[PDB]
Structures are given as C-alpha cells and as structure tokens.
Amino acid sequence: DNNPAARLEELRTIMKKNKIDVYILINSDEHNSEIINEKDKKIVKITNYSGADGILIVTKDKPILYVNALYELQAMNELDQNLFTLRISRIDNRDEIFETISSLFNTIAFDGKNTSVVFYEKLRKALLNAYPKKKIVEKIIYNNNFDDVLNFLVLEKSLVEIYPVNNKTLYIHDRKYNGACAGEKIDKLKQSLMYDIKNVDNLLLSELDEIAYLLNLRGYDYQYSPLFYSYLLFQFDREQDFSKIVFFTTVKNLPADVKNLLEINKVIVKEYEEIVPYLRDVVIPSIPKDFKKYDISLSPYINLMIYKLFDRKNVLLQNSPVVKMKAVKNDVEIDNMKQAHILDGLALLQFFHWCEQKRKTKELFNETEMSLRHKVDYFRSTKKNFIFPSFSTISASGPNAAVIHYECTDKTNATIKPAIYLLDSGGQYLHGTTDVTRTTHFGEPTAEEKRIYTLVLKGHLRLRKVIFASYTNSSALDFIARENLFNNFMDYNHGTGHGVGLTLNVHEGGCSIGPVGGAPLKKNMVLSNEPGYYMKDKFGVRIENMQYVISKEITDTTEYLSFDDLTMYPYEKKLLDFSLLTNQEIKELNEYHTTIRNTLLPLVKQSPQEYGESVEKYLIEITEPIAI
C-alpha cells in the first residue's frame, strides 16, 4: 500500500548517514505555485496525506505534520495518527510551528527548492531568540557532499526523489488577446527601474505568471495554469536601459518562431537548472562591493536556494513591478475577459440545462459528483479558444458542499441527491481566466436553505453594485459582503475576493477583497466576489462572480467607483427568501438576469445545432423577471 512507516523508517536512516537531526518537508515548489506538480509532492509519499497544504518535521521522536484548518478533516481521514503526530494550523496558532521546532537538535535541513525565504527567516529568527548562546551556521549542500560540515542546511536536492514529463511547446499569446506587446511591457518595467527602484540594478522574476505575462508566452508545465517553468533575470544599467535579459526555461519546449523572436530583445536563453550556477558564477562575482544599494531584488516568496547564494544584507525582498502591472487590465484585456465569461455562461447554461432535464427524468439521482464535474468540464471544452479548466472543479452535493475546497475522487465520490448542489468551476481561454460558483437545489428547498442562500446573496449583490470613493480600502468591501451574515452571528472562513490573471493563475495578487490586508482599488482591476456560508454535516452555499472596477461618477471633490460584471449566469430562484429581499435587490436581480438574456440568447439561437430550443426556453425561464 506504498507504506510510509517503511518510507519513514527508511528516511530516518538517510538523515542518519548525513548527520542530519531535524528535517523539514513542505508542500510547494521553487516558484511558490499554489498548485504543485507531482515531482514536488514529497510529503504524500511519506505520510499518505495528499492534501496540498502541509509541513513535515522529521525527527528522532514522533514526526509532526502541520496542515491548514481547511484540510484538517481530510488529514484525519488520510494521515494515520499512530505513525505521525497530527496538528492543525489556524489564524490563531500560525507561528506554533516555529515555536515547535524551536522546542527540539543541532543539525537541521531544508529543501532549498521547496522552501520560501519567509518560512526560513521566521524560523531562523525564532532560534535566535530561542537559544541566544547557539551560533547558526548556514550551508548550501551541493551534490550530496556533507563531508564539509546550530547548522542550518539548505539542500540542493531533496532527500526524497521521485512522474510525467511535459514535452509540449510554448506558444505566443497573441496581442489580440493581451492588448499589449511584450516589448511594450518590458519598456514599462524599464521605466520602473529608472524612477521607482533606484536602489537595485538586478531583478529576478521567479513568479511564473509574471514571466508569462511579460513575454506574452504560455506553456504546459502545469495542469491548471498555462504557465511554464522559468526564471527571467534583468540587469539594469543606470547610465538608462537593460544590460542583459536572461531567460532560463526548458529549451526543448522552446519553439523556433519564439527563439528567432527572442533575438528581438537579443535575450540570452539558458537552460532552467542553470539559474543557480549562472547566478553563483556569472552574476554575483560581477557585482562591485545614508542610501543603501542592494545587489538583487527578489520576490518575497523566492525559494531558499536562490536566496542563500547572496549575502542577506544585499538582498531586497519585494514585489516585482510586474505585480502592479498585471493587476490593472487594459481595455483589450477587459474586452477579452468579457468574451471568456460569455463563453463560460454558455457552458454553464448547457450544464444546468442538462441537469434540469435529468432532474425531471430523475436520472439525475443516479449521477455522481464526479460525473457532474466531467460534464461541466466537457461543456467548457467545446468552447472556442478553450485551453483547459482553471482549477479543479468543486462539485459537491448536500453535506459535501459544507467542505469549502471539497474534491470528489473515484474514491471519494457521492451520488447526486435532491438537495443542495454547489459547483465552483472555471476555465482557461486564450481570452482569459474565469472563476464562478453557483449553488442550486435539486429537491424541495428547506426554509433554512433559502435563508442561508439569500443572506449570502445579499452580501454578493451588494458587492456587485457598491459605490465607493476611490480612496476606500478594499477591506471595507469585504465587510459589506459579510454584513448580513454578521447580523446573524454567521461568518465564512475565507476571503471575499481575489485578483484574477488573464490566462494566467486563477488566484493573482496585486489586489484582493479580504479582512486582513487591503488597499484602495483601481479602475480595470478584476476581482472575484464570493461570499459563502458552510454548515458541517448539512450543506453550504457560495455565490461567486468575477467583476472589474469601473469609474461610476466624478464630482468637483471626489471620484466614485463601482463594479461591472464579467460573469454572466443567473442566480437560483428556488433558493430565494423573499422576506429578506428589498425591492432594490429584486430590481438588481432582474436587471442582471435581463442583461444575461440579452447577451446569451442571440448566441444560443444561431447555433441551434449546438444548443437548440429546449436550451433557449430554459435560458428564457431562468432569466424571467421576478415580481416586485
């Protein structure tokens, strides 16, 4: 059964032969990707815990696994707790793991590729004030030679080695989709280095979405984002342009038309694994010895390996200027995002149309969560310029809808019931990235269900149309999405909205709508709006749109902003509690539903082959105006 006690008792020996006392294993990769590929999942092979968020301290005593609160009920069900000590991380306890590992051992090791500098420093600075007497000697271990050694050891290669290789080639993201040339974007980044960042002439881009966005390239190295393993190094020459641009990537996956076009900036192209020896040997020795000058600017979550090549005093950890660059879409991008959402609405329509028909036949109740998940994914795949799903589809019936990130498996699959059904799904298109949730009911809704839905919907409708002065902090917008739940002493354990990339990652930084951290929003930022509520062992609801920031009104004194919709799919009338709904909400519902009918109905009618009249009747039905 791929035994862990076996692999653990095996590991404890390899730690021993290396004189390595305490070993930290974390689920992540060297690009700080939310979703990691298989080659990077080490934790699961040792614990049988396949959950994405987790950290593994491996010691002489009983190993400890930290996981996030959202993954806990899966870790109890997965992780055997006789072999491994289980523990949860919460917003409460966050630093507990730092406290813990401070509480045990004179030799410690880390995967240099799989650890962020953030984790490392917080730990290292936990052990500074833990044991002021002990001296910390940090070392990068190259080619399993430990014979040169508080020892902090950054490991070049993992002690856990492993999976499919991707041979598919990179492709250009055409200007018609992205609205701006790679050259223009690189010229903007150039301007940032002149004006904004004057204390650094060297910048490394480690975030894959930033590199893809800037070069207008996409790739196949990840299942849910069209990204590709890469680094992009910039070296600035003050007296006022780029000295060199070095692109590290998988060269065999580099097509011919892209290489010649990479003679346009005269970009040097290296292989991916050469980033470390190139920085170590070529870059760093070249940098010469009131106002402080830094050797290099790295992203905040840059992997430990790349970081340790420098002297910490000379590294500057901050966002790339690309972060703000991508957070504000240009109009071509917005227009393209609208087309992607239009295509998605058509796909949702087919999916729920099909559900509804099978609901009548009652064949819907021999279906499973997995079956329904493949169907919506299918309907999206028949859409023009569709690449693949933008994340793993959440298809959850009844009680499983209370599990926020719930994943059906061939193993974990449930029969569809005449109950709450939650569908969180999205797609990657040449036109953009989409993320949408709708909650519906296949049975007779209970009073509690309607009420929970409507209280979630009220927060959601409010955030669709909210009018706010331009200075307003986005944490205020997060609050009004929760108000109606607050009034009932109810809350949801996640953020209200995140930024979203154009054909990049479904979760993009640079802006958000959430309770902790927040900033003012700018026009043509794209954000999700997704309040929810979750009742364990019963059901849950989430309602999610994507929308973008528009200018609502400008007076002599003040600029007011609002949002406009990207997502076009209606809400569920069977779940409405009309005792909770003001007429302004009902009109807003009606105005939205009519906009949907105006948009999608003419597209439906002209592909009667693909859609047909049962579909348009269904569309007309779910968009019919509600009575005041």
């Binding site: 996030n68 959202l70 994340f391 959440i394 926020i404 990130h405 969180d424 993320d435 949801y492 354990n493 996640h494 953020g495 209200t496 909205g497 995140h498 979760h507 958000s512 709508i513 959430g514 999700s528 997704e530 929810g532 989430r542």
Partner: peptide
C-alpha cells in the same frame, strides 16, 4: 475558489 476562496482566497482564504
């Protein structure tokens, strides 16, 4: 899904 949720930003968390």
């Amino acid at each position: 899904x949720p930003p968390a």
